[PDB]
Amino acid sequence: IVGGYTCGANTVPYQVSLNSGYHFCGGSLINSQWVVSAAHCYKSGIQVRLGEDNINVVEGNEQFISASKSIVHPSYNSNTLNNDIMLIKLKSAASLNSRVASISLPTSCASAGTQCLISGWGNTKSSGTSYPDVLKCLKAPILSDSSCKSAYPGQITSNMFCAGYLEGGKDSCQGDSGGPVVCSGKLQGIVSWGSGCAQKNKPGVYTKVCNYVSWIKQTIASN
Ligand SMILES: N=C(N)c1ccc(C=O)cc1
Ligand SMILES: [Ca+2]
Numbered sequence: 001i002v003g004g005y006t007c008g009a010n011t012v013p014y015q016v017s018l019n020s021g022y023h024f025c026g027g028s029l030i031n032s033q034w035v036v037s038a039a040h041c042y043k044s045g046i047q048v049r050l051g052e053d054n055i056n057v058v059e060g061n062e063q064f065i066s067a068s069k070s071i072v073h074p075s076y077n078s079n080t081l082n083n084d085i086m087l088i089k090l091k092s093a094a095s096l097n098s099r100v101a102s103i104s105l106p107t108s109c110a111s112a113g114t115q116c117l118i119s120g121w122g123n124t125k126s127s128g129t130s131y132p133d134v135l136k137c138l139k140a141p142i143l144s145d146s147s148c149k150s151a152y153p154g155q156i157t158s159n160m161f162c163a164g165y166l167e168g169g170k171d172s173c174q175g176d177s178g179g180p181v182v183c184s185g186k187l188q189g190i191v192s193w194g195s196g197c198a199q200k201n202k203p204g205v206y207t208k209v210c211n212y213v214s215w216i217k218q219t220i221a222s223n
Contacts, residue, residue, distance in 0.1 A: 001118065001136035002126045002198035003170035009053035010061055012119045012135060014103035014187075015180060017049040018088075019064075026120040026179025028187050029102050032093040034220055037178035038190050038207065039076040039086040046070065048090055051100045054133045055121055061099045065090045071219060073212070082157045084192045084207045086178075087219055105217075106186040109210035112144040116163060116183035118204070120191060122175025126168070126198035131175060138172065140164045142183070143203055151201055159211050163189065164203035172204045173197035181206050 016035055018025040020043055027037035027048070035048055051061035068091040073083040094100055110116070118138045124130050140163045143151075148162035156162070163181060164171050172179070172191045181189025189206030196202060 004138035010099035013101035120176030171198035
């Protein structure tokens with residue numbers, strides 16, 4: 001997260017870190033057994049780390065649970081990033097409490113202008129590279145589809161939305177991938193892609209979660 005702020009320990013209780021010997025992606029806990037992330041985060045040997053603030057220090061609220069199964073969206077295209085969504089099942093149910101909690105799925109899509117909270121442990125610099133140890137947060141508005149399409153000609157599908165600031169300086173970044181965009185207590189977005197980070201006229205692009213609620217529910221129901 002570039003141009004954001006320190007969230008505060010366990011203030012984003014649905015935020016997960018995906019770990020394969022090191023943090024490599026975010027995700028969102030949606031019930032005791034399932035995490036939503038980006039398909040471009042897919043790999044084998046994932047350990048889901050819940051209750052994290054400092055990802056390099058055991059602070060006392062963590063739950064580490066190995067993934068039993070990952071399900072990449074049937075229509076994920078890694079070239080265009082269309083349908084950039086994946087479900088991860090935990091080998092055991094997380095113990096839910098105030099610091100480890102699920103986030104609600106939307107019942108309808110969010111509108112341009114809605115303020116949302118974007119979070120993760122990704123790069124904090126728009127030029128160089130600096131990875132934070134503690135969770136970073138950004139409050140950002142959803143942008144109009146027309147401005148999103150204008151920013152990224154020929155690249156924005158109906159499964160994507162832009163959020164952030166066209167002026168630059170405030171954005172998600174590398175390492176935030178797969179993490180949440182939460183608006184009025186609903187998971188509306190997943191950190192997906194962008195041209196660099198926090199660049200002028202290049203806002204963050206996010207997977208449009210409301211399109212996938214039916215798929216998420218039925219997948220969970222049978223797995
Ligand atoms: N919001 C962005 N600028 C952004 C988000 C994720 C990636 C993934 O590597 C790249 C750029
Ligand atoms: Ca920790």
